[PDB]
Structures are given as structure tokens and as C-alpha cells.
Design a protein around this ligand. Structure first.
Ligand SMILES: O[C@H](c1cc(C(F)(F)F)nc2c(C(F)(F)F)cccc12)[C@@H]1CCCCN1
Ligand SMILES: [Zn+2]
Ligand SMILES: [Zn+2]
Lengths: 214, 127, 98, 25, 81, 91, 96, 153
RNA sequence: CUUGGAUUUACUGAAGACUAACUACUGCGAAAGCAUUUACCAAGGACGUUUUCAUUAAUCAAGAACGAAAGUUAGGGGAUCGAAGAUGAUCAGAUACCGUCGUAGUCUUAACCAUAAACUAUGCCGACUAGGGAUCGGUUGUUGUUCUUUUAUUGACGCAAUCGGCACCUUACGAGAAAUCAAAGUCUUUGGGUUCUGGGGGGAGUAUGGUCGCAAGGCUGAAACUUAAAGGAAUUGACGGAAG
């Protein structure tokens, strides 16, 4: 009778420049009218898109990125980094019996007042010549690993902006820094930054958003 | 290129939901349930009802402009079962064979990191 | 008589073990006594693998697996044939079957 | 009677004797 | 074994034993002359020392206690007394 | 000798008002009339004047407090927070 | 550790206890260390450390109250302040 | 008399003439005679200090809080009570608080409160026990006691 | 419950609980019990020790501390499940099982209560008696190993010894009515120390007196009378809305 889909307009999502492939996709919303503009009814939407589709490599298939629109230019939506998470399957495939799991998180503010919660995860590594069934670290070793995780996450997020942090998240620089820093404690494997959570945004600077789009 | 939506399939043991949105999920494209395709409550979760619902969803997506869908599959989750209901697979297959193109697939079942008390009491459901 | 030297659970050297809820009936069963099965399954039935390969916009997309750990009480475990009643000498066998 | 429910019966029986005789201390 | 010499255990077996379970209990600790590269004198240190032992004018710490044997510091040799 | 078994200070009320009300009274009336250590001079000479007013006979300082004890639990948590809220700020 | 060092001074050193005695030991310059309890009034505390500056005497701020300082010195009475005149066979003076 | 909470007499210098100003405050628990009290926008977060609600972080306990800016105190004034700061809305210059009754309210961030809990808390935990205690209670409040039941008339 | 938009979907917020996966024939504690991070506080076993004291010890009527869950009192909290209650089914009837709600309760702070198949249904201390591979903690000697860093006093792993612990497998000399047992052995070839408990089945953990408790109850605790078995472990059969 009505077809609400007759009154819809389509818009193009755009990723920031920190990612390779920027044409994320398309969304739709009612046409802008006298009462409600489409822009403000559309600013603030969040899109979850796989990192593999953003970069063009299946090596990033297990991470997915949240992109939040905060400016509309004609038919383009300018989105910014809104968070990182693992797919459920990858996280389940990592967690396994006969080995220790060690986890840490920290709340840290970027160089440009972006407040984040960062979650690191790691598992004890089995040595090539090992004969014993289990690979457990004593609780003190896990505590020291956790301390290293937190202080490196602190250092690497505090001394950079949200865009530089987005650039750092892609090649797992923090993960490799954790792996290197904890070799002398206990061999570790699958050291990941498994989740990044955006707790606070600062005052919106439109000019800095445009700097990251084209 | 393709225009992607997100097919959000909620397959419980009582029903199956074939629900396509846009990428944000804030706009519904089509929503059809297994219970729309049968006249009996007992087979609202049947694979055949799920496949019928998936075809009708696929037709609606075709006429709207959706040409492909990513897959978000969930069980009931929470304190309830984590195993997907029987219609989820048939709905997934019908979507893939309907002409829509397929993107990523993920399981999004709600999983507690421990939780509230599940119903049924200490001695369980006594059948 | 005493049927099992382990009392039908796995608690030696501790007092109390917290319960878990049976998947089937939601009965409270001690975690050491619960019958537990680790399952890793293909998310798509092996029949629809080719349909979903044909319909994929990607080429060489690795299909995700389903991971789940299942907990049963004794009643539901026996009822659904996760375990079976064994003979008196066979009960002692603890290695997994083949 | 499932020995447990016999004790509960004596509990109730003994509870009522506590009230009959309290009429007289 | 039904016939065995309990008065003369073979020295290898007797050496594998706990210190309190030989025919006559005996310590496995010892005293050692330790030289430090800075000085030329010698100090007498217990093998399982519990004290971070100092010395004369070159009062550099010579050992640090652990759960068992004392860990000799970087650049100190020892000779068993 | 032990003059009463359980009434203690509420023995001034005799047999009246009910045992539960007298027992509830005893808890707070004991705390009401007790001597508390002064946090200023360190002597156990703090006594109640009226509800919420606690005076030290020795150093003559008065502090606001609870109705029947010098300090209430809600007040203590507030103090613990503030003195914590600056230690972590300096670090 | 500080309490044990001070405790050994009391057993084998020379000291005087109490505010009036401390002020005298500062005027005669016989004081080697002044210790002030945490609940000492700020007025008396700032007077004592003004005397200690005139006589070039170090000041230690004991973290317990006058009740706890008196116990640390082996006394059954409160001590609001004391001065060490001779450290005895202790390294209290070199360790503050 | 008539009040469960003690009062604090606090002296201030007059900024504009050579003269001493005395103020009557509701005493929070822990305030002592001789203590220095700080009131203003830049005042530190200490028990007994008077601060704008916008200057207090979330979770702060505060009493004698102003409903409107400058009314000199309306909320959380009786013994043992207080007001909790719930959240801030800096763009609107509004603060959200929780009242003793459980109600939640939005107040201007320029309204003031006194850090801490009102002293004298716990009065009602002890039974009055006697008609005479109630008589002495209302002897300094108003003529509201004893009460004749309506059905007895 | 839903065209007054249910269910479903995305974003955001608020509350109480709880601490998944990792998680084990693994750890700790007197037992009850104990599982997110960090900091602080005081304890602890084991190990190491050519340190110290020198019999200070074992077990214990009386007497004390702690003691799951439920339950009690007073404040606070009350998401979720949920005794009572309400209600839909089923049924010959079900005030039951199953469905939907839901009070107390579930949580916390001050006090109580003192009980569980509180179980290893197995008192505590001490000595001795047989083979085996694993594992947790400490210590001691030693690499075809991975890694700092190229190497030490990196770390992980690997190989041996040892003390302590949670256990397990085989045997059966021995024990036992047997089931089974590394103690439940060293017991008619009957004696290392010591505490507690039982004496056919019921009546009955009842009555009464005492005592503790706010109460619910806990502890102590008979007799009249009644009765030929009750009971344990195993065997063959039969039966099973058990399995193959
Ligand atoms: O929001 C909380 C909070 C509580 C309390 C208390 F309940 F004790 F009164 N007071 C707080 C205060 C206080 F009022 F200044 F004491 C400030 C900020 C936070 C407070 C927490 C307490 C731990 C530190 C972070 N704020
Ligand atoms: Zn079950
Ligand atoms: Zn005083």
C-alpha cells in the first residue's frame, strides 16, 4: 500500500584514509523533508565492517572494525574509527585446554583526547622439543606478563593520535611489541589486541575529520 | 559491484527469523519468519518453513536493490542454548540458492562471561 | 555396595566444586561430575558447501567453524546416548573410544 | 514414608504438643 | 632383593640419597674460599649462605641468597675447603 | 559481682516497654555513653554532648558526628574516598 | 625498620621524651634528631621545626600518633615528640 | 532545638568593609571547631567545603544543596541525609543528582553544596519508648502531638 | 503479548547478581569452603640451612573458635531465578510433574541459628611391608632444544636425583562375608600410644527433667509395650514405560 522504500535515499559510506579500500558500502534513509533532514537522522550511525574488506587481504579476516558517520557531504558519509573486535569464531579457536590464558585491559587517552579501553590477550607457547602434556605458567609469571601488556598498551596508545593508533592496529605492532617484551618471562603465542573500545569522544573538529578523507 | 545488506538469521528451537537490514542494521529491508509459512505452531522452526521464509526475503531484497548479504547467525544465547535451531541452515542455503550473493559469515550468539540464574530450578525440567 | 572408586565424579583433594547447569534440562550438576563434550563443527552442512561457494562474492573464502562446549547431567547424558551403561569390568576403562 | 517425611511429621506433631501444654505451663 | 649388604651401600646409590637417609646423616653443604677480582684476599663463605656477605675495604657484596645455594656475584671464583 | 545478666544499662527501665525494644535501646545507649579516642590529642576523653556533637574534655575540641556514635559508616566511606582520590592523582 | 632502629636507640642510646625537654635539647644544641608524632598540633610542630632550623637539626615525621610513638619507645605513656641526643649503637641518624 | 542535625557557626571576613561575618551552616560529619572552611568555585574537594555542583566529580556526596543558584540551600539538610551527584551535562550547564527520597533531579551546575554527610545520622534507630519522650520532642517543634484518631470522634 | 506496533534490528543508558571459555583424576585451606584486574594488610605449608632452644611432646572428658544451604532480627538493596500463592494444560482426579506469573527468599551490613549422604559413609600420632609410570611445590646435578642477543647470572623446554603433596595403574604376599583394600596389611603366631562410638528389629532420637535459642529448633535423653527376624555382600533366574 505504502512502500516505505519509495521515500528512501541511498548514501555512500566512506572509510578514513587509514584503510586501503575506502568505499565501504551503501545505506539508506527516508528522503530529507521539511521537518526532518536526512543528515542529522543519519549522523551517528555505526557500521561494522571486516578488516579484510577494508584492506583487501584475507589475513585480516578475523578482525572487524566499527566506523561511525559524523559528517555527510552530498551523498557521501564520512565515517571515523569507532572500535575493533575479533570475530567470535577466531576467539573460540584460540582458547584451548592444556595451556594458560592471560588477559589484560587498560583505559588510556590518546594524544588527542580520545578515551579508549584496550584488551590484550595471549596464550602460553609450547616448545618444539616439549614432552609434557600441559603448558602452564605459574601465577607470578602470568602476573608479570599482564604487567608488561598493560604498560606497553599504555605507552603505545598515549603517545599517538586516533589516526596513528588506527595505523598501528592494522599490522599488530602492539602485539609484536608484547611478544618481544615477554620472551624472557615465558614463550607466548597468538598475542593480539583483541578489542578496542571507544569510551569518550572529544569535541568534534570537522577540519580534522576532512584531513582523513581524501 | 554488489550492494550489501546483512542477513540476520535468528534460529531458535521454536522459530526462525530471516531478517535483512542495511549494513548498520538501523534500516530493515525484509523480515519473514518461519511462523508466517505454516499453520501449526510445532513446525514454525522446521527447515522447510525457514527455506520458504528465506526465499520470500530474497525476493523482497531483489526488488529493493539488495544484491548480496553478509550473514549474522545467532542462537537464543543468554542463559539458554548456544546451539543453533534447525531452520538456520536451511534458511542460509535458500538465501544462497535464491540468487543473492553471499558475503562473510559469523555467529553472533549472546554468550555470558557468566551470568544470571537460568530458569528450571535446581533439579531441572523433569520430563 | 560402592559402585565406583571415584564416586562417579572427579573430586579428590578438595571439598566443594561449583555446579554447572545441564544443557538439556538446566539441572545443577557439579562441574567435575558433569559429562562434558568439546565440539567443533562446520557452520554450514556439507551439502550446502558448494551452493555457498558458488554464491560467494569472494574467491577462496575459508568457511568458519562452530565451537561449543556441552555440559550434561547424568540423566540427560544417558537418555541422549552421549554415554551408555557399560559392563562392570568395562566401566573401569577411562581412555576415550575409537 | 521416606524417613525424611516421617521426621517432618513428628516435627509437626511435636510442635502441636508445645501448644497444648503451653495452655497450662 | 632378599640378600643385600646394608652396612656397605654402594657409593653411587648412597650419593643419590637424601642427606637424612644415609647410614649416618651428613651435610652436602660446604665452606668455600672466595676471591674477588678487585681484591687479593680470601673470604670464607657458607655454600648455602643466607646473608649477602660483605668483605674488607673492598666491601663489594660477594654472594646473594637464594632458596638453596648462594649465588656468587659477577666475577667471584670459589674453592671448596 | 555481675549485677544483671543481660539488661545492662537498660535496667533503669525495669520490666516496661517490651524486651525487644529494651534490647534495641541497649545497643545504642551503650555506644551513646562510651568514651572514644580523640583524633586530635590522642586521649580517650571524647563524650557526647547532644546528638551529633562530640566534645573532648582534654583538648576542648568538638567534632560533628553521629547521633549515638562519633562516626557513622556512610561518613567514613566519604573520607576514605577523598584521601584516596588524591594519592592516586599524585602517584 | 625505623621503629626497630629507634627501639635500639632507646635501649642503648641517649634521648629525651616530651615537648619541653626537646625544646631545651635544641637550645643547647645537644639534639641529633627530632621526631614528631603525626597528631602533634601544627602550631607546636611548626615551632619545633623552626627551632630545628635555627640549630641545624634534622626532623623526622613519625607516621603514628603519640600513642603509637610511646609504645615504639617502650613506654606506657603517650609521647608527642622526642629528640635523640646520642644514637648509641644504632644507625638511626644515618638512615632518615 | 527542633533539629536533629547540629549547626556550625563559621566566621568570614567581609570582602568590602572591615568587619566579621558569622554564618550558620548545617554541620557535616567530621567538621570540627577550629577547622578552616573553603567556599567558592575554586575551593578544594574537602569535607565541609562549599563548591558548585559542576566542580564535583561523579559520585560525590554533598549536602545542603541549592535547587536554584543562590537560594542558599534546599536539599539534603536533615541528620544523616545527603545528595549524590550522578552526572554532568556541560553543554547545558546542568548536573543530575539523586535526592534522599530516591528521586533524580536536574540542577544548574552553578548551584552549590557542602561536601559530606549531614551529622547526627542514626537518630531513628533508637526507639522513643515513651509518651514523655515524644512530648519533649514536639515541645520544641509545634503543637502536633498527641493525635486523636478520627474514628474515635 | 500484539496494527495503541508485539517479536525482530541497530545505537545509547540504568540497575542488581554472577565471574563463562582457559578449568584438569590440577592448586590452597582445620573443615565449611575458595576462580576478573590491581594495590594494601596480617597469616601459612613445603623446601633449603654445618642457625637456635633442648623434651618444650601425642591424644584428649570439662571448656572454647569456626561451621554449606535453608531459617530468624534490623537497616540497605531487590536484575535474575523463585518456596507460598495465582493461573493454563494434562488427568478418572491431580490443589503434582509440563507452561505463564510471582511473594518470601536469592545479594549486602550488623547480629543470631549450629545443622547436611557436613562422605573417603574410612578418628589422630608413630614405625614397618611391593612393583610402575605420571603430576604440583621446593631444592640439587645436567642438553641433538626454542629464544634474549652473538653469547653470560635470560627464560622456556629436555635429562636425572631428591624431600613434601593431590592422585592413579598392576599385583595380591597379606586382609576380608564379599564387594573390594597399599591399607581395610604387619590381627587366635591375638599387646606401639591415645580419643570417640555400637551390642537383634521396633517403640524412638519419642516421653519426661535439664539446658541453649527471638523463634524455628539444637544438645542431653528413658521406659512400658511389641516382635523372629530385620540387615549386609554376592549367585542363578525372572522382570524393567533400560541399553545393544
Ligand atoms: O564515585 C565514587 C565516590 C564515592 C564517594 C563516597 F561514597 F565515598 F562518598 N565519594 C566520592 C567523592 C567524594 F565525595 F569527594 F568523597 C568524590 C568522587 C567520587 C566518590 C568513587 C569512589 C572510589 C574512587 C572513585 N569514585
Ligand atoms: Zn539434564
Ligand atoms: Zn582531644
Amino acid at each position: 500500500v505504502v512502500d516505505p522504500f519509495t521515500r528512501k535515499d541511498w548514501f555512500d559510506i566512506k572509510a578514513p584514509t587509514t584503510f586501503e579500500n575506502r568505499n565501504v558500502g551503501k545505506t539508506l534513509i527516508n528522503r530529507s523533508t521539511g521537518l526532518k533532514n536526512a543528515a542529522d537522522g543519519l549522523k551517528g550511525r555505526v557500521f561494522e565492517v571486516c578488516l579484510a574488506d577494508l584492506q583487501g587481504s584475507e589475513d585480516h579476516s578475523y578482525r572487524k572494525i566499527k566506523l561511525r558517520v559524523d559528517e555527510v557531504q552530498g551523498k557521501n558519509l564520512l565515517t571515523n574509527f569507532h572500535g575493533l573486535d575479533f570475530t567470535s569464531d577466531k576467539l573460540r579457536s584460540l582458547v584451548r585446554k592444556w595451556q594458560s590464558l592471560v588477559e589484560a585491559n587498560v583505559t588510556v587517552k590518546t594524544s588527542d583526547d580520545y578515551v579508549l579501553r584496550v584488551f590484550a590477550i595471549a596464550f602460553t607457547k609450547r616448545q618444539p622439543n616439549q614432552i609434557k602434556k600441559t603448558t602452564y605458567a605459574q601465577s607470578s609469571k602470568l602476573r608479570e606478563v599482564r604487567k608488561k601488556m598493560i604498560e606497553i598498551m599504555q605507552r603505545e596508545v598515549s603517545n599517538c593520535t586516533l589516526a596513528q593508533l588506527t595505523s598501528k592496529l592494522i599490522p599488530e605492532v602492539i602485539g609484536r611489541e608484547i611478544e618481544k617484551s615477554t620472551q624472557t618471562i615465558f614463550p607466548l603465542q597468538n598475542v593480539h589486541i583483541r578489542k578496542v573500545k571507544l569510551l569518550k569522544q572529544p569535541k568534534f573538529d570537522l577540519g580534522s575529520l576532512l584531513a582523513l578523507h581524501g | 559491484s554488489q550492494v550489501f545488506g546483512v542477513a540476520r538469521i535468528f534460529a531458535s528451537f521454536n522459530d526462525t527469523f530471516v531478517h535483512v537490514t542495511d549494513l548498520s542494521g538501523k534500516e530493515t529491508i525484509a523480515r519473514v519468519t518461519g511462523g508466517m509459512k505454516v499453520k501449526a505452531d510445532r513446525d514454525e522452526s522446521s527447515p522447510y518453513a525457514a527455506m520458504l521464509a528465506a526465499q520470500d526475503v530474497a525476493a523482497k531484497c531483489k526488488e529493493v536493490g539488495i544484491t548480496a548479504v553478509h550473514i549474522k547467525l545467532r542462537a537464543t544465547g543468554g542463559t539458554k542454548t548456544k546451539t543453533p535451531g534447525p531452520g538456520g541452515q536451511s534458511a542460509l542455503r535458500a538465501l544462497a540458492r535464491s540468487g543473492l550473493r553471499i558475503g562473510r559469515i559469523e555467529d553472533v550468539t549472546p554468550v555470558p562471561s557468566x551470568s544470571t540464574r537460568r530458569k528450571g530450578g535446581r533439579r531441572g525440567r523433569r520430563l | 555396595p560402592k559402585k565406583r572408586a571415584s564416586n562417579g565424579r572427579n573430586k579428590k583433594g578438595r571439598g566443594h566444586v561449583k555446579p554447572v547447569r545441564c544443557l538439556n534440562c538446566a539441572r545443577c550438576v557439579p562441574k567435575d561430575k558433569a559429562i562434558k563434550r568439546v565440539t567443533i563443527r562446520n557452520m554450514v552442512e556439507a551439502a550446502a558447501v558448494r551452493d555457498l561457494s558458488e554464491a560467494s562474492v569472494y574467491a577462496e573464502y575459508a568457511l568458519p567453524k562452530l565451537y561449543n562446549k556441552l555440559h550434561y547431567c547424568v540423566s540427560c547424558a544417558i537418555h541422549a546416548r552421549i554415554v551408555r551403561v557399560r559392563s562392570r569390568t568395562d566401566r573401569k576403562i577411562r581412555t576415550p573410544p575409537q | 514414608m521416606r524417613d525424611k517425611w516421617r521426621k517432618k511429621r513428628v516435627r509437626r506433631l511435636k510442635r502441636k504438643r508445645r501448644k497444648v501444654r503451653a495452655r497450662s505451663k | 632383593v632378599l640378600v643385600q649388604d646394608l652396612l656397605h651401600p654402594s657409593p653411587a646409590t648412597e650419593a643419590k640419597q637424601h642427606k637424612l637417609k644415609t647410614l649416618v646423616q651428613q651435610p652436602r653443604s660446604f665452606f668455600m674460599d672466595v676471591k674477588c677480582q678487585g681484591c687479593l684476599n680470601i673470604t670464607t663463605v657458607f655454600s648455602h649462605a643466607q646473608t649477602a656477605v660483605t668483605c674488607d675495604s673492598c666491601s663489594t657484596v660477594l654472594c646473594t641468597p637464594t632458596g638453596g645455594k648462594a649465588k656468587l656475584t659477577e666475577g667471584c671464583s670459589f674453592r671448596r675447603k | 559481682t555481675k549485677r544483671t545478666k543481660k539488661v545492662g544499662i537498660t535496667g533503669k527501665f525495669g520490666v516496661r516497654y517490651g524486651s525487644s525494644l529494651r534490647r534495641q535501646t541497649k545497643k545504642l545507649e551503650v555506644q551513646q555513653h562510651a568514651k572514644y579516642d580523640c583524633s586530635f590529642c590522642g586521649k580517650r576523653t571524647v563524650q557526647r554532648g547532644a546528638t551529633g556533637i562530640w566534645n573532648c574534655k582534654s583538648c576542648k575540641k568538638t567534632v560533628a558526628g553521629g547521633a549515638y556514635t562519633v562516626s557513622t559508616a556512610a561518613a567514613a566511606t566519604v573520607r576514605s574516598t577523598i584521601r584516596r582520590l588524591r594519592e592516586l592523582a599524585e602517584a | 625498620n625505623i621503629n626497630s632502629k629507634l627501639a635500639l636507640t632507646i635501649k642503648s642510646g641517649k634521648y629525651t621524651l616530651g615537648y619541653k625537654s626537646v625544646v631545651k635539647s635544641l637550645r643547647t644544641g645537644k639534639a641529633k634528631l627530632v621526631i614528631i608524632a603525626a597528631n602533634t598540633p601544627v602550631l607546636r610542630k611548626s615551632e619545633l621545626e623552626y627551632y630545628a632550623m635555627l640549630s641545624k637539626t634534622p626532623v623526622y615525621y613519625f607516621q603514628g600518633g603519640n600513642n603509637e610513638l610511646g609504645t615504639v619507645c617502650g613506654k606506657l605513656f603517650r609521647v608527642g615528640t622526642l629528640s635523640i641526643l646520642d644514637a648509641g649503637d644504632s644507625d638511626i641518624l644515618s638512615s632518615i | 532545638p527542633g533539629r536533629g542535625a547540629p549547626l556550625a557557626k563559621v566566621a568570614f571576613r567581609d570582602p568590602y568593609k572591615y568587619k566579621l561575618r558569622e554564618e550558620t551552616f548545617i554541620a557535616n560529619e567530621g567538621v570540627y571547631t577550629g577547622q578552616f572552611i573553603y567556599a567558592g568555585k575554586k575551593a578544594s574537594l574537602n569535607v565541609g567545603n562549599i563548591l558548585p555542583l559542576g566542580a564535583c566529580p561523579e559520585g560525590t556526596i554533598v549536602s545542603n544543596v541549592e535547587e536554584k543558584v543562590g537560594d542558599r540551600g534546599a536539599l539534603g539538610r536533615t541528620s544523616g541525609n545527603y545528595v549524590i551527584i550522578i552526572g554532568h551535562n556541560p553543554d547545558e550547564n546542568k548536573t543530575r543528582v539523586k535526592l534522599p527520597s530516591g528521586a533524580k533531579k536536574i540542577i544548574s551546575s552553578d548551584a552549590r553544596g557542602v561536601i559530606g554527610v549531614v551529622a547526627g545520622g542514626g537518630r531513628i534507630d533508637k526507639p522513643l519508648l515513651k509518651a514523655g519522650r515524644a512530648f519533649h520532642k514536639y515541645k520544641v517543634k509545634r503543637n502536633s502531638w498527641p493525635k486523636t484518631r478520627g474514628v474515635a470522634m
